[PDB]
Curated annotation (Swiss-Prot), chains A, B:
Tissue expression per record: Detected in forebrain. Detected in dendrites of neuronal cells. Expressed in the pyramidal cell layers of CA1 and CA3 and in the granule cell layer of the dentate gyrus.
Biological classification of the source: Eukaryota, Metazoa, Chordata, Craniata, Vertebrata
Highest taxon of source: Eukaryota
Induction annotation: Down-regulated in the pyramidal cell layer of CA1 in the hippocampus by global ischemia.
Protein name: Glutamate receptor 2
Domain notes: The M4 transmembrane segment mediates tetramerization and is required for cell surface expression.
PTM comment text: Palmitoylated. Depalmitoylated upon L-glutamate stimulation.
Subunit architecture: Homotetramer or heterotetramer of pore-forming glutamate receptor subunits. Tetramers may be formed by the dimerization of dimers. May interact with MPP4. Forms a ternary complex with GRIP1 and CSPG4. Interacts with ATAD1 in an ATP-dependent manner. ATAD1-catalyzed ATP hydrolysis disrupts binding to ATAD1 and to GRIP1 and leads to AMPAR complex disassembly. Interacts with GRIP2. Interacts with GRIP1. Interacts with NSF via its C-terminus. Interacts with CACNG2, PICK1 and GRIP2. Interacts with GRIA1 and SYNDIG1. Part of a complex containing GRIA2, NSF and NAPA and/or NAPB.
Note: The postsynaptic actions of L-glutamate are mediated by a variety of receptors that are named according to their selective agonists. This receptor binds AMPA (quisqualate) > L-glutamate > kainate.
Function (record text): Ionotropic glutamate receptor that functions as a ligand-gated cation channel, gated by L-glutamate and glutamatergic agonists such as alpha-amino-3-hydroxy-5-methyl-4-isoxazolepropionic acid (AMPA), quisqualic acid, and kainic acid. L-glutamate acts as an excitatory neurotransmitter at many synapses in the central nervous system and plays an important role in fast excitatory synaptic transmission.
Organism the protein comes from: Rattus norvegicus
Subcellular location: Cell membrane; Postsynaptic cell membrane; Postsynaptic density membrane
Family named by the database record: Belongs to the glutamate-gated ion channel (TC 1.A.10.1) family. GRIA2 subfamily.
Positions spanned in the full protein: 198 to 246 of 883
Encoding gene (name): Gria2
């Protein structure tokens, strides 16, 4: 559903546990190539994998 | 070096152990989106992850 309007820029406002799962599922579906953008909306940017 | 001539189609002639490592490093560098091709050149196509 995020490919209906051809969305390129996503802000992830999740905690230290959900961000890793969302990044793992993005990597599984393959949406981390050059052309997109992500923001890890917390203070622990180095906490995730 | 495989992006010099803009290669799209890669045949992987490796055993059951090296194929998983190559697929993991492709997923790490992000070259498994729609547009590329792969051939797992062994009899154990369902053996890998
Ligand atoms: C950061 O993420 C965004 C979203 O994917 C992308 O931003 C684009 O980055 C390019 C650099 O590759 C920039 O283009 C520049 O545009 C300015 C306009 O003033 C121009 O003067 C420069 O010569 C250059 O062409 C731009 O900031 C930005 N937007 C567009 C439309 O290109 C990109 O993925 C990431 N950018 C960086 C720098 O990390
Ligand atoms: C992965 O994606 C699809 C599914 O296997 C493959 O797409 C098919 O590619 C062939 C070769 O380019 C297409 O044939 C072409 O048809 C056009 C239209 O007549 C013709 O002008 C070309 O000369 C060529 O014969 C075929 O149409 C296309 N299938 C569909 C449904 O569009 C693709 O090759 C696969 N492999 C990759 C990307 O390595």
């Amino acid at each position: 559903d995020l490919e209906l309007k051809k969305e390129r820029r996503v802000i992830l406002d999740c905690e230290r546990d959900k961000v890793n799962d969302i990044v793992d599922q993005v990597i599984t579906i393959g949406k981390h190539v050059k052309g997109y953008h992500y923001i890890i909306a917390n203070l622990g940017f180095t906490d995730g994998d």
